[model samples]
Target chain A: TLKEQVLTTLKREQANAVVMYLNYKKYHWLTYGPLFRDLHLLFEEQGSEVFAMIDELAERSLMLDGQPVADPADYLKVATVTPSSGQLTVKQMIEEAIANHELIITEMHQDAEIATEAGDIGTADLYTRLVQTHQKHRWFLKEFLAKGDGLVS
Target chain B: TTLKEQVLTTLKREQANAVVMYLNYKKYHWLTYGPLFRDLHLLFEEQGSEVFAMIDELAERSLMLDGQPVADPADYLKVATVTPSSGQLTVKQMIEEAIANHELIITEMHQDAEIATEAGDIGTADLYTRLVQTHQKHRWFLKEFLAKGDGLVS
Candidate 1:
């Protein structure tokens, strides 16, 4: 049997997608301000992408003969990232989003390295491909944080 | 070849660009964390979603042009005119980058519409009309998004 670590890693990450997608959409409904129209529409598209990413993770799980959790309850069970806390501010939300990305990427490197050391090229490569998406998101937040002096007053 | 096919070729190229733009928009959507968090995040997400729809419109027009749409994800980079570079960017920087990319699509659509109009292909020309308008609108939004009483990244 393939290492249980790979399956557990994939499942954990899969749950991350579940939670992430919900927040992407949740934040959509939660969003407000002068930029309301603009931000809501933007969140919608990402909601779709996250929706797409969730399927990818699910299929990968199925390919490994490990059925992914179809129920929301199960997703929450394994999800390493959760929803924003008590009416978060812009700073707090960004912090939350950043944490959301880091958790996935953090667990990701583990899945990647272990898969590599254990000789499962598929798992390792999938991890690599998956990492690219979050890193871009992570980078975006970082850039905004780094350059915030002028961006948000 | 009918003028429609040539228009298709240009459309595919433009369609390819749409894919990359959305990827960039999606990046912004997720990255839009901080200061104006609520507004910025929603703006990028909506903007992302707005451009997101165009990819399909562009691709579907490709099929109508009697050509192929993007079939392989692996080949996405080879054809995209605007590949996203990695890193942190100010809201202004991100908006500025979008404006520039929208310029590329706007220019291409304008030229292609002109060619199609000359060929008497009203359908193809009309499609381009809507496209250029979409890009122009996005360009305007970003410009306003960046329009401050002060300055931006140097």
Candidate 2:
């Protein structure tokens, strides 16, 4: 039961996770100016964490009788998160990261619910933990723009 | 450069791209119609708002870095890789377009994530963790839609 759900979800999650990890890396490399230090270091840390999760998610998926989407070509076919192609200013990078995060959180919530319904508590738990962490991060990020203090509106 | 500034800058760029994609979802949300209209419209709206939150976060980070955040719509148009919709589209067309757009973003995100990894940005990695879930959902939705016998619009 748990195995089936985990296996099914892992395929999709693994592919998506890999692409997501890459996007964060891009932002880390190209970020510049005053916030460069903070964002650069933060992205490095974040990227590593995500990479680890990707491995866990993929490994779990395989343990449940599902094959993780390991090939880059296959990943490209299934990934929904888009990558930044051209160069961008500091502002653009921030906006893109936030937007992507929102998209991921919603999906994780939905997936977690599905896993719960399927009686796959482990997968559900993983997704729920992910959702909580993401929401907190997003809240922190949004707070930066809430007051009229940082970056003029 | 200070560590704070680096984190802020990278986060901001990632957020901007998220905004561009979120707006695209909004366009489809409003225009989507057919039997699954309610379901898809609601999904898009929720997704769009989520993306919007990210934009706000990115802007705030910019300020934290001691730099002004980009708030202008014009700025988004200039930097966004996701193209804008032309205001009207059939359900099938909208679905197909979205699928293409998601694929594009997924590629871009991978590039971004890789760079962050090399620099050792843990916060950004956490950000990507949740992001992958959303992208996978969208892919699943589109894939399911494509496989439907009645097609996406029906």
Candidate 3:
């Protein structure tokens, strides 16, 4: 069914959100040093956005007649980001999160293109919005790691 | 309406709408929450002030053209695309509402910029052009921090 394709796209983003959220939580605990106070708060904040995404994407999937791939282990089957084995500093965490957003951005654009063509405008609008949220959050992460202008830093 | 009349009507509403939005920004900024509230609050205040600045520019431009800008607070809401919040909102709701309202104005501002240009009112067109960019930038910032959601459930 056409809904199947939309469900497939939703599951991918759903899995991505799971992996990203775990990564954020891991780093939130791992954060320390001079940046510890701020990084802890920022990581927690960023994690909340990712956590919220799971509900939004999953609910969309359910609305299309497919259940979200909810199991923690199931996320590994589709997530682009793999869990880290060793502790990473705030800088390392930022790099990893930024890379994850890039991956999600690529898939979201592709998914959005198909959904739009296949008459799933609901999914299309969803994709456009979620991609921008990723962009904004990336800005939050990027500026924290960079030593550039006030805008980026 | 004469083209000048058209420009006046456009500017009046646009100015009034901007005033309402700026106030919303202040109201929402004060209501900012969560871990990043401090930074986000500061960001909203800066953006709110920028919209206020644009409001001044628009009103003065109308007066320069012998068009009296609407000055009543009630009249401002009367002409605006947005309304005052009915009650307290979740912080995310506040931000999302601001994003929606910015787009409301941006769409109108975009068309009127062209209208001013086509009517040979370069001054007013530039004013609109300037106003458009501020809203665009502010919208991006609002959208950036806006909680990720469809703002609906199914």
Q: Evaluated with lDDT, which candidate comes out highest?
A: 3
> Residue B127: error of model 3 in Å?
21
TM-score of chain B of each: 0.86, 0.77, 0.90
In model 3, how large is the Cα lDDT of residue A34?
82
Give lDDT tens digits, candidate 3, residues A1-153: 566787888998888888889898988899888878888898899888888888889898878777999877788897766665586767887898888877887788778767877799788777766765675577667667657676545
Candidate 2 lDDT over B1-154, as tens digits, reads 4554555555655666778778788888887887888988897887677667777766765564467676776776666676666656888787787777766765655555544555576545445545644555565556566664675445
- TM-score of chain A considered alone, across all candidate predictions: 0.85, 0.85, 0.89
Output the worst ten-in-a-row residue range by lDDT, candidate 2 chain A.
Answer: A58-67
Which residue runs of candidate 1 sit more than 4 Å off their true CA positions?
A1-149, B150-154
Model 2 stretches with alpha carbons more than 4 Å out: A1-153, B1-12, B64-68, B150-154
Report the lDDT tens digits of candidate 2 across residue range A41-71: 8777766766777876775564344567887
lDDT of 3: 0.80
* Least well predicted 10-residue stretch by lDDT in candidate 1 chain A: A141-150
**Any runs in candidate 3 off by more than 4 Å, and if so which?**
A148-153, B1-154
